[PDB]
């Protein structure tokens, strides 16, 4: 050649240089400020800042409005609210009191002059090494003069405040002096200027070139490119139409990955925010160290965000996984291998067994599956072909795998375990061309990587991310989860063991199987003890572990392993690992789980459970091998005719039972929201769980009519006998939909922190602080909670007036609901029917003569915690065609001091659907687990460092809005909860699913802010260019 | 009680100069004792009830 040798070798080092100089070259870091006056008016402005923690303040105030406030007078300005949870606990007030002045930052005491020695404008700052409060001019009174200065704080950026915004109570025009400027965190929202841009194109540019340099000078042994598409590729059968088809139903209907909400929210946040931010965990920093996958999601989302199309990654690298592994992997494997039919249906059963729990979602762990199967098949086209661009694209894909995620290191693993045969290529075209050109061009796409992971985001912020991410993150159980034992573990390891026991076998190529066998023993080594991702993982060996299962099955064959002793072992350790699966309940990630066969306990069919079947038939297949341990058969066909292919059989059987649990899943739970359902209502135009999510606008409006007497002491609610029923007998404290503990939690509501006992009697006289907006003016409570005697209270009340009899009124109105409490007996579907007390709506008729008969009564459905502020659902549907009046009746048979309940009259709520109430205009505080869920409210994204205040906060299911997603986003730890939580007022409200009444679908709380809280105006400033520039570390916990 | 939360303070009560005695001095092997689960070879001296 002599005319590629060297375009190869420049464009190599000249791809190499430029990427790996790539998170060295400037950016145009576009910052923010946040003057207090903006234009004259003195209006509180709200900047929640999404990384809590300004670089400085500066802050100036004069003399002349500490003496010009009120006698208390106590908020001349701060940067928490009036009466924010934990505010002086974040954030700086800076307050008057009636002898002292507070400059008060985390809860550390600064400057505490006196209120008649309060100037020369004293001025407040805090920098990086600040907090010097100072008093300019001014002398103290008491202690050390210090050379007179009043020089008071304390040298730590540890002790910085969380600017939410500012808020002061004086009104009018700005003393001269008055300025809070302060400059807000603006480290990641950064775009790369000319250079930077210009480097980018020029190492891809130049890498491309030097990979076809390197496919020029590689093809001095001839052999073109002929045929194109493979002779084994288009014989298409029917394995491939059932892991095809199978996969399209499982893509429609099938469940999504747990983290599903996580990635799709930050992916459509990240496109206005413009640095791919880690939404809600850390300090808004981005986990752009390794996402450019969210990228290609981030755009992805420009259009319409559907569940059943943002996750078309997770379909389309299904169908090139399926189709590279029947037809190139496969054939590669072995004449064997491809020549038995059993061999190609168990991959195909095994891919979409591993394919359709774990990565069916949007975390990706599909893709890193599919990328890993590229480079293995790049390396072996590379070994196979005798070339060296194949081996070169596959170091770039294995790089880009590994820039999908950190485990991703599957890649590398392969790429390591198939480094032996390139190696040999390499010294095999050592000695025609220069050992230089075929190095460079492989460390070119070696590093190329570098080009687009940092892409908007220089060395110094990622290392920023990465100490933030290890600072406060961690360092370091289902029917159909547990499979990651049934799929590699059962069927790599008797693989192994025959390919070591046998040394050539007859079918299986030696080589390719043993780098199949590497790839999931070397992800093992580094990725699953030393790695910090939680275990349990199979998505990952969806691909390659599929491949696996194919070695299994042609080696525990009977034409390879001859003992039938072995082969009946084998299928006895095949049904001990199906009824070590089982042995779980049936429980899907979050609203998957939406009717489903044994969601709640273990899978028993016909009595006894299935485990015990599974277990009794391996242990009746265990002594059949046994017994021909003994007597040595090794020749009784009756083992050839049932070990005839085990390993297909067990993943048709898994793959059977999860596509039948969402086929009933979806069926059962039709006219309501599963997830097949709303996949496909998702074509018309239609949000997929808020379209049928009814919560009513108004509680305090919709309250059934008392007939028109009361007759008791405590409203018609007690109709006779309020036996010994206690206007306010209720615990000192319980709230809604909550278990109010001790210690402060941290993602609560208003109601945690409010007066212990309302400041007005009300309509009945019982001052409970009632939940839900119910007003104690209109909605008179009843409960029966006296610890001096536990005398078992039994009230029939008074009948209410229902509404017409109209089925256009039925329609809108299908529950009648009581806002009760206490320990009592519902019908939820978390648990069974469970027994607290026996409190229920007996519902009676009166055609003939007026007067009501109570004829039966109907049970209760309930979803939240037991001692708490729920409210029980009655269906119109169990209310009959003719019934004119209801009547709540109640009954405290329990001595126990545990025991209780407490009633509020029967309501007609006028329900909307979440879409019709809350649009897209408003934004929500989507939390981690519900994001794919609710596909249409635009959620609080942020722009340069600020976020725009949310209105509603839609959250799962109790039990995990509780133990797993409030600690995920709290300010201790990063957090959005550390902003909102700080500002505005959370009120949970009550929701109700349609037509699936006692499910806990999770809950949605209206914000309400504490002020008048203007948006603030911002002015921003954008020329700062740094090289690897820092400015310090953020704020986080001690 | 250098502490603005409210989740800190600190209760006091005199000092005392107490008699003390071994465990096997005071509580003999004539006294049965519950001994723990835990705890049943660091005591070998007293009988259990």
Redesign the interface.
Known sequence: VRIARWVATIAGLLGFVLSVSIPLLPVTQTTATLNWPQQGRLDNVTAPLISQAPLELTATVPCSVVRDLPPEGGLVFGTAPAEGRDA??NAMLVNVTETRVDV?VR?V?VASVNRDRVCQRIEITSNLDGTYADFVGLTQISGEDAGKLQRTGYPDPNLRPAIVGVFTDLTGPAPQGLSVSAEIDTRFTTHPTALKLAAMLLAIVSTVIALLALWRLDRLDGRRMHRLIPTRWRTVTAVDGVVVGGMAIWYVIGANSSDDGYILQMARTAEHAGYMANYFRWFGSPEDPFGWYYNVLALMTKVSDASIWIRLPDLICALICWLLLSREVLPRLGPAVAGSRAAMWAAGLVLLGAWMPFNNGLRPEGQIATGALITYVLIERAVTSGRLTPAALAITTAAFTLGIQPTGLIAVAALLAGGRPILRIVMRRRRLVGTWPLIAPLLAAGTVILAVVFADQTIATVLEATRIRTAIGPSQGAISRRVAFVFTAMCLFPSLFMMLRRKHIAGVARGPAWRLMGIIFATMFFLMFTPTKWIHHFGLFAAVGGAMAALATVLVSPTVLRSARNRMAFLSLVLFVLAFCFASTNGWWYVSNFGAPFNNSVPKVGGVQISAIFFALSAIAALWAFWLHLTRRTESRVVDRLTAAPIPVAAGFMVVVMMASMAIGVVRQYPTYSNGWANIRAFAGGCGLADDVLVEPDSNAGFLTPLPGAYGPLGPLGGEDPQGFSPDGVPDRIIAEAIRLN?PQPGTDYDWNRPIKLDEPGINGSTVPLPYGLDPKRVPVAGTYSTEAQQESRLSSAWYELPARDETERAAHPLVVITAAGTITGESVANGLTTGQTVDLEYATRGPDGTLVPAGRVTPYDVGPTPSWRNLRYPRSEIPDDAVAVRVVAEDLSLSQGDWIAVTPPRVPELQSVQEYVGSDQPVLMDWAVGLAFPCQQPMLHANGVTEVPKFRISPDYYAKLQSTDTWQDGINGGLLGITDLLLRASVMSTYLSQDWGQDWGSLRKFDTVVEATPAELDFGSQTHSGLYSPGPLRIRP
Do not use: G, H, R
Request: glycine share 0%; proline share 0%; hydrophobic share 65%.
């Open positions: 002086a606990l008060i809860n005491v210690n």
